[PDB]
Amino acid sequence: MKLTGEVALITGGASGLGRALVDRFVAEGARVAVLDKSAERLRELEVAHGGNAVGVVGDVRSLQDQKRAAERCLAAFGKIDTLIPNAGIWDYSTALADLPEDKIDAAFDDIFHVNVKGYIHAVKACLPALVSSRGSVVFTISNAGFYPNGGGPLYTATKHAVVGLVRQMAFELAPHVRVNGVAPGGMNTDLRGPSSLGLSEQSISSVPLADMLKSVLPIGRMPALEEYTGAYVFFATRGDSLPATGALLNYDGGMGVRGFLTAAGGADLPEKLNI
Amino acid sequence: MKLTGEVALITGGASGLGRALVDRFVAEGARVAVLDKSAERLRELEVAHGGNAVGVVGDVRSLQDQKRAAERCLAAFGKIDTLIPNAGIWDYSTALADLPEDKIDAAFDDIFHVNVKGYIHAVKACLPALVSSRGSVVFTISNAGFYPNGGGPLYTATKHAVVGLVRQMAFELAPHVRVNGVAPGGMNTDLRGPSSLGSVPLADMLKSVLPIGRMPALEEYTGAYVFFATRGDSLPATGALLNYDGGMGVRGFLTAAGGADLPEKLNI
Amino acid sequence: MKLTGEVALITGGASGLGRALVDRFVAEGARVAVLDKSAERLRELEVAHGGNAVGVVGDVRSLQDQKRAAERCLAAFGKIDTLIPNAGIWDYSTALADLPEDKIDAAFDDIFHVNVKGYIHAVKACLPALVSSRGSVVFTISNAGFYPNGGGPLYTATKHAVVGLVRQMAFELAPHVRVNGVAPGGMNTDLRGPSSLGLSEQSISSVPLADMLKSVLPIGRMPALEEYTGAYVFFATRGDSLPATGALLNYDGGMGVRGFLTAAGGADLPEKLNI
Amino acid sequence: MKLTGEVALITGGASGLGRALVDRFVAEGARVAVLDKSAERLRELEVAHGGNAVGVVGDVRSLQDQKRAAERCLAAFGKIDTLIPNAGIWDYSTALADLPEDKIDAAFDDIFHVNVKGYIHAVKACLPALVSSRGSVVFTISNAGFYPNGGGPLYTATKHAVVGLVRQMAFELAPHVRVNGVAPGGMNTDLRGPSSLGSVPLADMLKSVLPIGRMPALEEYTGAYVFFATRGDSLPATGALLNYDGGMGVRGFLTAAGGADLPEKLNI
Ligand SMILES: NC(=O)c1ccc[n+]([C@@H]2O[C@H](COP(=O)([O-])OP(=O)(O)OC[C@H]3O[C@@H](n4cnc5c(N)ncnc54)[C@H](O)[C@@H]3O)[C@@H](O)[C@H]2O)c1
Numbered sequence A, C: 001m002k003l004t005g006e007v008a009l010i011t012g013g014a015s016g017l018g019r020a021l022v023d024r025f026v027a028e029g030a031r032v033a034v035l036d037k038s039a040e041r042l043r044e045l046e047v048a049h050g051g052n053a054v055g056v057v058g059d060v061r062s063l064q065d066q067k068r069a070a071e072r073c074l075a076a077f078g079k080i081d082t083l084i085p086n087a088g089i090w091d092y093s094t095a096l097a098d099l100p101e102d103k104i105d106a107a108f109d110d111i112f113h114v115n116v117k118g119y120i121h122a123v124k125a126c127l128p129a130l131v132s133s134r135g136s137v138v139f140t141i142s143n144a145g146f147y148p149n150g151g152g153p154l155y156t157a158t159k160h161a162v163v164g165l166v167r168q169m170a171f172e173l174a175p176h177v178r179v180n181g182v183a184p185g186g187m188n189t190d191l192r193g194p195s196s197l198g199l200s201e202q203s204i205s206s207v208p209l210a211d212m213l214k215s216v217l218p219i220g221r222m223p224a225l226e227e228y229t230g231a232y233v234f235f236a237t238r239g240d241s242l243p244a245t246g247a248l249l250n251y252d253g254g255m256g257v258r259g260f261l262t263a264a265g266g267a268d269l270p271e272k273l274n275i
Numbered sequence B, D: 001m002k003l004t005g006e007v008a009l010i011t012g013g014a015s016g017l018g019r020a021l022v023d024r025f026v027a028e029g030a031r032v033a034v035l036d037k038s039a040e041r042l043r044e045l046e047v048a049h050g051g052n053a054v055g056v057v058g059d060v061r062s063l064q065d066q067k068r069a070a071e072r073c074l075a076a077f078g079k080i081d082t083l084i085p086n087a088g089i090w091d092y093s094t095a096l097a098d099l100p101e102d103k104i105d106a107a108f109d110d111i112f113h114v115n116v117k118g119y120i121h122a123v124k125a126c127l128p129a130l131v132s133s134r135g136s137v138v139f140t141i142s143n144a145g146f147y148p149n150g151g152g153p154l155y156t157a158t159k160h161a162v163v164g165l166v167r168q169m170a171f172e173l174a175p176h177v178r179v180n181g182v183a184p185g186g187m188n189t190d191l192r193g194p195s196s197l198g199s200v201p202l203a204d205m206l207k208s209v210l211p212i213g214r215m216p217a218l219e220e221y222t223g224a225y226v227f228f229a230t231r232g233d234s235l236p237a238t239g240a241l242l243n244y245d246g247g248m249g250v251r252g253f254l255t256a257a258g259g260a261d262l263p264e265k266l267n268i
């Protein structure tokens, strides 16, 4: 177990990637505080991991809620080693042309409050614990932080904003707190969109994400959620990532290195090389 | 004159770089519409340029104001060839640790609404005109869209967000509208910050910041925008990001420039 | 005319993009020294531009030849304002698996000597003139300097190497000489490959470059050579590019911002927006 | 132990980071083959690890030597799961102006042959084994693959060239072999330079260089490579570039770190 004795706070950890990370982190011997708006899912996760996980109901948009999360983590586990600001919503790749004039202001505020302000508030709230533990922050970005067509303008802009948070916060929190980014690409989660665009009851598992990506990913297949948790384990292992700050790990199946006419260049290698 | 007959719409054009841009674009034979909140400075640019500039008083955060600018530019000039969303506000380089808890949510909204939303609204308002003209968008970014310590988390995130608008809108508006970013940096102008808030002068730290070893006048940053506005010269460019900041991203560890002693080394 | 009184030295200016740049620069009122191995093409270009262009026969791999070029430019025109190191050869996207063991060492040396060493030698040779004129260097890179599948390992590695030259030289030559990169994407030129791979008598005009790129470029069409000369004009205009050093202009039709399932996202905008 | 049963081939593994990597990989339950020119240090690592390491004396510039390493690793261990091309030489940060005209062509060949060609040959030699194992390549890059002043033009260009090998080989070897780069930086080891050639200690300039404010031991850079070698943890990653350099790319203008006074600010 790589993370014995470590304590993480994960925002958005009641489902999706956040939950997989909760499960993974605990299995690696970490204790985990989760901040999330789903009270139901938070309790299921507490009973799933008796004594190694504590859920706090709150909204990542509220600094006070974030502070409560940090307080609760401190109260239960005595420190915070790794903050993983992870809660997010999608825009379902709604193009600028397709954003209605009378909804765009509301949609902007929703997606940016959650995706960017929620990350700032998480760090703000945990800053005393992180300086104390000489800890780290690992932000969940996305391939939409680097390339287009992973989201419309709003989502792509929020995830690029998060890259800026990686950079600025690695600077500001240095030398005491390390700040890095994992940018995963394509995950069968329960990811929602803004109620403003009528997408708040729409989950990404309901989209054929895996099949759209089949001929877009050089690796050929969209990885399972468990397969995305390793990068975070890595950044959360103190002895393994000490030199890392300002690091951005593109963790998306090769989206930035796909070819022009096909995703991959080496379909024929096995036969070409005779086994 | 390289922009004869072209029409530009510039947000934040009543002062600073935006005003340098208006002036340069007018001198290149373009006709310019300007959306800015400052009535006095809009009038001031209007008298400067006669009928070659039109000012519209409004707020970049307002999609309606952005539509009025668009409509005004079309009424005045018949088309919009190049849109320069440029208005932005700074955060004074206020560190996260230094953002007061009772100020932070308001600061966030103010700087994102102006710096990111006002860019989104400009494009949205101008989209019919830009597609009709097979036009261009050129976003004013900043060094803070690429490296830290050019503002606080709020400003740095806003400018990274506009890099994201470059990339996404280049994709979405292709093949008809070209979308690119200029990332200015060596500057020295009163970039205002939010009412909810309130650093070392650039001159005081120049050799730690700019390999070019000097502080360009505002006039010297308008060329990149003219280039992107010039259809004959920038046709291949979409999704491009022009770091325009005196070499901030390629500065040395001990001093910005690596070649102070080249003249002595080469005897000249 | 934007470049009246300016003097440029362009390596590889006897054909392709280099020649278009020679033509463009002269039409903008510049004087141009060209270093190139084709004596024939260099004379055609001298007579094309009587008094505004001077050709020097030489090999970009030879520092001494490069120095002669610089000497000749000085002798004819009195200064050097802008160096454009531009000469290059392709590898025809020959995959690592397809590089024969007994040719790879030779192919490496050929492509790297021309593409990287030729650029270093150009700058070295012109360095006294450039410091004297407070001039600039503008390197011809390629989309292969940023993304794969624009060349095999060799070519892609040489063009990434050139990005490193932009950065390191902008640093080293600061504050007296500015150093920037233009990275064009897809040009109907006479571009050759290494004799080692049997491609030295193979030109890129012989490849259906334009048609392969039709559904890869967000802009929809591969631009003509003339349409790529503007970026260089821009960097060569002193009053327009003074703040620029370390700049990399991706100038390739949108290759880095193409979508997953299609190159462009806005085919339908005209009808969608009602004109 | 996270690498139980896996086989690594590491070039440049008899000393520095490469030797740290060998040791770490062996401690994680991997078996390692090493290509290095230094016979003495290969023997030294061989006695250190018993049959868990095999050394092959050879030159990374030689494709035949790289094939012999590959062949030796297969004979010893039956497969190759992860290839770490790591051998590289420095240029002492010799500026272009300072490269002697009678030395420059030879220096160029020496540093490119080792730093770029030896990486190409490693992959070429190991390609059948890596495709057979659905394996990984992890190139040692450097901060000089991303920012200036980490070496001269020759070293900086070589390391930028390996970023290009990351991208191209990730494309070419997909979907079977994953290709990624680690870009180490905070280090302090005798990185040798060419015979044709011949700067400030890192310690002397640390606060201008590393936001992490310390100089990690070599042991502290092996984790990233273990990660990429761990099939259960890094399956999504191809074409990835991990800046592993103490924050060199996110350093401040006046000082590397922006938060020296956070403990006082937050009272702890
Ligand atoms: N799913 C994908 O395809 C994908 C790809 C790349 C990156 N991401 C990013 O991964 C991260 C995790 O999302 P996911 O895909 O696992 O979706 P998800 O909905 O399954 O998980 C998101 C979690 O965030 C919580 N949450 C949302 N808003 C909140 C708020 N205001 N306050 C408190 N909790 C809130 C939700 O309750 C949920 O438990 C997000 O940042 C998302 O942008 C997703």
Ligand SMILES: NC(=O)c1ccc[n+]([C@@H]2O[C@H](COP(=O)([O-])OP(=O)(O)OC[C@H]3O[C@@H](n4cnc5c(N)ncnc54)[C@H](O)[C@@H]3O)[C@@H](O)[C@H]2O)c1
Binding pocket: B011, B012, B013, B014, B015, B016, B017, B018, B019, B035, B036, B037, B038, B058, B059, B060, B061, B086, B087, B088, B089, B090, B114, B140, B141, B142, B143, B183, B184, B185, B186, B187, B188, B189, B190, B191, B192
């Ligand atoms: N000045 C620098 O140091 C620097 C460096 C890099 C990038 N930038 C960027 O340059 C761009 C403009 O800078 P500048 O030099 O013109 O700055 P400036 O502050 O001098 O001018 C900004 C203009 O925007 C207008 N404006 C501000 N808020 C507005 C609103 N809500 N609605 C309408 N108009 C509004 C102001 O009236 C003013 O005319 C901004 O995007 C800025 O972030 C500045």
Ligand SMILES: NC(=O)c1ccc[n+]([C@@H]2O[C@H](COP(=O)([O-])OP(=O)(O)OC[C@H]3O[C@@H](n4cnc5c(N)ncnc54)[C@H](O)[C@@H]3O)[C@@H](O)[C@H]2O)c1
Binding pocket: C011, C012, C013, C014, C015, C016, C017, C018, C035, C036, C037, C038, C058, C059, C060, C061, C086, C087, C088, C089, C090, C114, C140, C141, C142, C143, C183, C184, C185, C186, C187, C188, C189, C190, C191, C192, C204
């Ligand atoms: N053509 C494309 O698709 C494309 C795309 C992006 C970038 N580029 C780059 O554009 C630059 C110009 O090449 P081009 O496509 O116009 O090809 P080209 O062959 O038409 O032009 C190249 C010129 O370089 C000269 N040259 C080659 N080796 C030389 C040497 N050793 N010494 C002196 N002169 C030499 C040739 O004689 C020729 O005149 C190169 O750096 C190339 O890598 C080409």
Ligand SMILES: NC(=O)c1ccc[n+]([C@@H]2O[C@H](COP(=O)([O-])OP(=O)(O)OC[C@H]3O[C@@H](n4cnc5c(N)ncnc54)[C@H](O)[C@@H]3O)[C@@H](O)[C@H]2O)c1
Binding pocket: D011, D012, D013, D014, D015, D016, D017, D018, D019, D035, D036, D037, D038, D058, D059, D060, D061, D086, D087, D088, D089, D090, D114, D140, D141, D142, D143, D183, D184, D185, D186, D187, D188, D189, D190, D191, D192
């Ligand atoms: N040390 C630093 O300051 C630093 C920083 C960033 C990146 N790097 C990179 O780290 C990697 C290795 O560095 P290190 O710390 O191991 O350096 P090192 O010089 O201590 O070790 C290099 C190893 O490569 C071997 N080697 C050199 N040339 C060879 C050849 N032609 N054939 C076979 N073997 C050869 C040497 O024998 C030695 O074992 C290199 O790619 C280097 O450029 C180093």
Ligand SMILES: Oc1ccc(-c2ccc(O)cc2)cc1
Binding pocket: A090, A142, A143, A144, A149, A150, A151, A184, A185, A186, A209, A212, A213, C260
């Ligand atoms: O955060 C996200 C959400 C959706 C995608 C996505 C990528 C490709 C695709 O075809 C559909 C969705 C990527 C990142």
Ligand SMILES: Oc1ccc(-c2ccc(O)cc2)cc1
Binding pocket: A260, C090, C142, C143, C144, C149, C150, C151, C184, C185, C186, C209, C212, C213
């Ligand atoms: O320098 C070069 C050479 C060839 C391409 C190229 C790009 C796409 C393609 O389909 C074929 C060739 C790009 C840059």
